[PDB]
Design a protein around this ligand. Structure first.
Ligand SMILES: O=C(NO)c1ccc(-c2csc3c(=O)cc(N4CCOCC4)oc23)cc1
Length: 120
């Protein structure tokens, strides 16, 4: 009489799974030509990015987003899409428009939005 056993069902498994294959596709060798910088966290030291810490308050990398997935730390794809768009925005936030890394970020983001938006 009380027992509701109610909840927005799983399916999000199918989301986070689909959110996966995206990233798995995002790591693809064909997209390597512009995905490789974003594979691992930016080495401000090795890259000498003196002010990247003062600006990028919440840096993100594809490797970092990948770990949260395996950790089931993402509630849903919207959380998942946020870290990704968090990754790019930093590329946009830190550097000038005409820079190459932005161009690499954009073509990578283009692949993302297509598969991402075409989730059911
Ligand atoms: O040379 C490399 N590996 O051997 C390398 C280079 C760049 C990155 C990278 C990924 S994201 C990101 C970023 O946000 C801004 C910047 N810059 C802003 C100035 O132009 C050159 C760099 O470096 C990155 C990662 C690895």
């Amino acid at each position: 009489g009380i027992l509701p056993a109610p909840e927005k069902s799983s399916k999000v498994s199918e989301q986070l799974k689909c959110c996966s294959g995206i990233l798995k596709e995002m790591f693809a060798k064909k997209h390597a030509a512009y995905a490789w910088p974003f594979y691992k966290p930016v080495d401000v030291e090795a890259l000498g990015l003196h002010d990247y810490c003062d600006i990028i308050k919440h840096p993100m990398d594809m490797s970092t987003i990948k770990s949260k997935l395996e950790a089931r730390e993402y509630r849903d794809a919207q959380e998942f899409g946020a870290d990704v768009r968090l990754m790019f925005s930093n590329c946009y936030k830190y550097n000038p428009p005409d820079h190459e890394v932005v161009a690499m970020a954009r073509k990578l983001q283009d692949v993302f939005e297509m598969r991402f938006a075409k989730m059911p």
